[PDB]
Specification:
This is part of a larger assembly, with 11 copies of chain A.
Chain A lengths: L3 H13 L2 H26 L15 H9 L4 H23 L2 H25 L7 E3 L10 E3 L3 H28 L1
Antiparallel strand pairs in A: 1-2
Helix pairs in contact in A: 1-2, 1-4, 2-4, 2-6, 4-5, 5-6
């Protein structure tokens, strides 16, 4: 994706970040961005094309998809990566002080916590192959099916553990400093 | 997208911009461009492919789509990002004075206001899954359906709040300076 | 698109161009190229896929498309951007004198005028959703339909106004110098 | 396309090439490569998808396509651009003498002549929308249809005139030097 | 893929890595990444589109695919390349000592062993064209078919031998140092 | 149809019927029965098969047919022929007196009047090719089409005039006797 | 139908039947048989062909039909006409005494009562256009639709009133004799 | 068809008809009825099923059929056979005098003349395979096709010559008597 | 069906048959023939048309039907009615003695017993809607479905009870005489 | 078919016909009528339904059928049976003299000769499975296929031999008498 | 079928036939005609409709059917019943002598033998569900499938045994007389 400029700015930040902070930044780039672009994008690229429902109603398919997946997991992770990354960028902008660092890491922690709990609220880290829905065009609660469920929950769990690791790094850095 | 050259020129501008102006430029790149290219493009990429209407008339589908979405939200945001960004480029061109800065920020403010109000006029920040249309080939006001409505209104609201934030930054910078 | 090398050469030209000429070059890159690649390409990318005609004849669709759109608007704009840009490149090649500058700007003006009038001749800046055609495989003047007509005429008008602005810049620079 | 490395090497050649030779190199990059990648690729990208023939035989379509277009025009132009460009690369390799220059330009001239005459032999610079073919699976000389014929012959003619211009440049440079 | 930044960091590591370690890093980039992106991606890009099963049930296809391929081989290799590469990045981060080197190479060895044995557990390096499955929507153990089985097992075997070579390099480096 | 037994009984009645009554009985057999069986049956035999509506909803077609034609015209005429014929059969049963004859002819007159006015109430002797309906599965008042409308209204008018002739015969016989 | 022989035997019975009994026999032949063969047969002849359900499951349609209509109304009326008619045939067989007549008419009465109440039990004289069913292949209680519902309930009501009339005739004959 | 009773009555008439009148009655039964039922019915039985039009509009087919064939030729001949036959039946009814015979034959002559001229008015004894129609749902005068045109015009001509023969017989009988 | 001649011969037999034998003959005609022709024929007339199986294999449907129903129940009943009826015809042929009567009734009894037990062997008086079959073209024991199962088992049971009644009549006549 | 009345009249003729003439009449009824109705009708009943041509043009099928079979063989035989039979009917009409008999048999002979030679002219007693046709909607002489060719030529040959036998009988009767 | 007249003539023959000959005539009517019309006709009525072959070639189906079944078994039995019955009709014609009887029975015997052996030659009393054919449009010996194979071979065997019984009757009558 169009990640060159952000990568440039964050690589500039890597000079001023703490050693643990460098580890966190590398966790971000190596895992969240690389996996999201390289692997996840191809997984979810056929999220709606292969979402075949049972009824031959015309509109039930995309409506029931929308209900099942209000926002796609990739989108939520793009927003999450950006939101969690942004405090670091704000801090370098100030640098280009310690209280600012504490505030920015706390923001990262709180936003990433908000994202893992919101994601759990929408889907509890376990896509199921089946979704029975009852939107208006869909008659009598038709059962619709999902594409690559297992692989999608694998990446969900993976990225959730990555976010938990980022939280561990941030709070341990906090208590440390 | 083909954003390398623009990014280069605006990064050159970042030297001369005010600190708040740097914050605004970063808001632009980090959120509007990155989200528009990375996330929104994949969302709207199946905007017409999955716009299934109910009638089996041949031409009703694309006509009713066109009526529903005269111009796609992504396109409007590409034009908006470019138009709002352009005054900054004009200012650096002059630099490569204070009155010029005031004029350019006022232009940014007014254009971005024009875009949020025009966008609201076309669609009031809430895509609905259903659109009943009555174009000529479409007989007897057939009801047609939209793809990923919820996710699209989420990005609409998101980018609308981002534009409101850009307006806050610009007017606070104005009153400040 | 494969615009890096051209951008490099024209950015080299930006050193020797006049201040108004720099404004023109920026108008070119910021609007014509960026919009053509970023926005227009996705618009016209489903120009033939979604061009559904009414008859169930096998060959009427693509023939009637070809008659309706002899050359796609994007193609004409790629050729126009290249042709209008080329005199500047010729001038830098000479630089790497005033009469040469006058000749090159006149060429730009005349070619861009030729393109706006040719484009108007083919389509008068207003795509209509309907096109009745009478090619040989198409029997009895079947009515065929177009994809995203409104959005396409919006970009047509937009780029036409951009070309008119480029003409204003070039002739005002001429009278100026 | 993957033209960065070639562009680098030829840009290195541009230092040692004659002024007319620089004009030729720019003609190459600005027109043949940029148009082939930016415009032609999207034109021919639906060359077989939209090649609908009349019979409901299973295999007639792709066979008759293959007969009609033994090799695609884009492919022939990729090979032509590479073959005609290669002598210049050979010359810089020697540089990194006058007789070598004469031999290389003669090679360019002869190869480009060979390509325009071969292309004319296969198709005489005028794609027609119809192609009646009589391959084995196709029964009783079915008439098949082509996608975007007019636009394709426009680019054919365009690139043919570009090749004629390259021949003019090369032979005038020859007689000159 | 989005491998530029990782490549930059690992190329920086290549200065501090041992000569055998440089050989290992080159094995990684030249074979695993280049093949995974350049060749494998196009192979598996039609993994579900062309996975045609026999029944005309609506949902059996994607469910049975998911059972057959819980996670795609490409995804597992992206995760494997990243996981095995990460210890090197951790080591350079420390550098930017010998015990650290030993720990990192042991981690690489153990993770890559874990990946080859896990991959064997899921699929024993031999995709078969047929997969009979008995998920709920699939009635009476329908036999479903796979796309490009032979080519996929060829790349599986290839990359498995590459991983075995990486293990040889790592353990020989270990015993050596 | 299974009209042999009824014909036998009515032919037995023809001995006792009045001369005008014989004319009426012959009008019945020659026109109403013969046309209903021989001609009308083949007309209405494709009444629902060829009732193609516009929407691709599954159930709209037969529902909208049912609304349009609650009972088929043939059925109503079978019931009408039987009901109007029955008084004659009752009279022969009594024969096998004058007051009975008067009562039976009055019954015939009143029932046939009831049938022509009821038929007019349902459809006013003019089937139109189009019927817009708004039943529940049919969305947004889809327009559905009818098979052989003109021929059906021709037979409707024909049989209506035949019933009017039967009324003329019955009342003139009444006033006569 | 194959009603000639039965009609012959019952016509032979008409000599020995009571005058009211002749009226009943004529009610039978004129209405139940003639309508069942002439009119009803064409109505129910497309009972399953046009029974379109909503789901695209393969087997839901005919299963749900079977549940909705365990036995077709025509079949039940063929069995009813035969069963109610049979006592008369038994009586003529004895003739070819008064107690026998009483027993046979009582049998007719009781069987016809049994048929009207059984028919009401299966369907309460009112076919509805919709039938939601939940058989095994039908998933999530799909709603299926019926052909010519209104006309079918009209004939149901008609024949039910005819059976009530036959009961009136039989019991009044009983009390009379 | 249900021609037994009519045949019985006309066979009864054959006793009282003149010798030439017997020849006419036999012409009627042997040719018009036998051919209409035995041969023509199977010809026109697929008149609408195989009436395939070119457009993929839903309703154009049956509408354009209706316009092309307002009433089917068989129907017109059933009505014609009945109308022309009826005067004979009226005459036997009177018999069961010479002036009556003259009036009835004149009626036969005039009605049959009316039918041949009306039939010519609708279709001039020459069905063509093609019928371009322009009803409302049919867009842009689509060309529709007819089933068994040649065979249908053969029977049309045949029966027209038979009617001309009946006219010859009737008028020669007239002048004779 | 073509039952007139057989009915004639058996009606001739009815003169010589015993009173109980007349009752049996009437049971035959009134129930087995009339129901088989009038009702059952329409039931089984869509036995294969609506036998939809689940797989999209081409040949599985009719093969699995054939396995499920080796011979249709109607056919078996036509053969049974003929075989059981034939001894009576043989006896009249002899008449046109008592030992012959005993032999013929015993034959009727034994054949009808053979038919009820054979029918039970093939299908145990209970058609189920589902039939899983494993013929060669059918892959992996696909489950296929049957049309009107309930109604078919109702007629099966009905006719089985009728055959049991015929056996009761025959053996009671035997013991009687 | 509706052959009862004709059969009655010809059976009446059988009294007055010569012994050889009775043999001819029986040849007619036993073979031509019985086979035409009983066997041929079911053969040709799917003459157009199963006439599948190769092109996916809409109208080529029925047009090419019409060209291939201008009039169906059954129709020609119905007309032939009627025309050849009619002279006998004319003769009985005269009877109800010897010169009349000679004239009628000569007419039979000449008409039947005309029919066998006309039939040969249209099709030379050998239907082939393939018919390449070049009507207007059919493009480039598509090859179309016929249903049950072998069986149809078997009946053609059969009936041709029957007509030759009728000619033998008629001319031998002539020379005899 | 149209068997009334033949039945009349053969019933007239039954007076003059020998007692064993009456048994043979009854075997004919009761079994061959009744089964052929009543049962077999419905079996073979879907002989080509449900003959689904595997290839998606357009013409392979009906061609391969024709090869598999040159003439349908029903047709062969109609011809056989007529041919074997005809000698009896010839004999009554003579009656209306003993040597004639012997000649006619010998003809019956020889023709029926010819038919059973010809039928065996075409198909050896065992329809198989599969028929691999290699006609021209059918490519690479595709395997096609047959409808109701088992039931068809059951009737084949049945009627073959009936013909063997007719042969037994005829030759035993011969030796007897």
């Amino acid at each position: 994706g169009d990640w060159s400029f952000l990568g440039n700015i964050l690589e500039e930040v890597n000079e001023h970040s703490t050693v643990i902070g460098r580890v966190w930044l590398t966790v971000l780039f190596i895992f969240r961005i690389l996996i999201l672009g390289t692997a996840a994008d191809f997984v979810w690229g056929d999220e709606q094309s292969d979402f075949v429902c049972n009824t031959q109603q015309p509109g039930c398919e995309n409506v029931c998809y929308d209900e099942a997946f209000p926002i796609s997991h990739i989108r939520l992770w793009v927003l999450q990566i950006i939101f969690v990354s942004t405090p670091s960028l704000v801090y370098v902008g100030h640098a280009v002080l310690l209280r600012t660092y504490v505030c920015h890491i706390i923001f990262k922690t709180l936003f990433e916590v908000g994202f893992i709990v919101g994601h759990y609220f929408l889907y509890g880290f376990r896509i199921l192959p089946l979704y029975r829905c009852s939107r208006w065009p869909c008659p009598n609660v038709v059962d619709c099916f999902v594409s690559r469920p297992t692989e999608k929950t694998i990446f969900i769990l993976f990225m959730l553990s990555v976010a938990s690791v980022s939280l561990f790094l941030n709070i341990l850095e906090m208590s440390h400093l």
